[PDB]
Amino acid sequence: EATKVQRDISAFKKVMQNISLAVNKFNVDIERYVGGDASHLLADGNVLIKATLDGVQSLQNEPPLSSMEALALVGPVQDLSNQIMLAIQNLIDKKEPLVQAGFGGKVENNLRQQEEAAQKLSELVSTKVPHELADISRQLSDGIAAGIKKGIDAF
Ligand SMILES: CCCCCCCCCCCCCCCC(=O)O
Secondary structure: OOOOOOOOOHHHHHHHHHHHHHHHHHHHHHHHOOOOOOHHHHHHHHHHHHHHHHHHHHOOOOOOOOHHHHHHHHOHHHHHHHHHHHHHHHHHHOHHHHHHOOOHHHHHHHHHHHHHHHHHHHHHHHHHOOHHHHHHHHHHHHHHHHHHHHHHHHO
C-alpha cells in the first residue's frame, strides 16, 4: 500500500544513545587510568551492563523492523535521500491531475524554492563535513539536486 506516517523508532535510537554514552564514559576513564583504585572503572562497567539490559527491556514491545525502518536506524542520511527521491517521482507522477487542478505553475514555483533551499543547506553541510568525506557528501547532495531539477523540468 501507499507510504504511511513514519514509524516512531525513537526507542531504538534511545537505547543506542544510552549504550553509546556509557561506552564513552568508560573510554574516557580507562584511557586516563594509570593505576591504583579502579572502583570507578567497575562502576562504569556496571552502568554499561545496566544500559544493555535496559535495552532488552526497552525494546521488548517493539514490532520487527521493515527494510525501510531498519535503514532509517542504520543509515539515516541514506534513508532521507531515498525518501526525497521518492517524493520527486511521486510528484512527477501526479503532473496531469495537478495541471487539471490549476496547480502546475505553483508546483514549479515551489520546486524552484526547494531547489534554492536545498542548495543553501548543501553548501553549509559541505563546510561541516571532514575533508575525506567531501566527495561522498557532495555526491549525495548533487543526486538530490539533480532530482529536484527533474521535478522542475516536468512542470
Ligand atoms: C509541493 C512539491 C513538493 C516537492 C518535494 C520534493 C522535493 C524535495 C527536496 C528536499 C530537499 C532537502 C534538502 C537537502 C539538502 C542537502 O542535500 O543537504
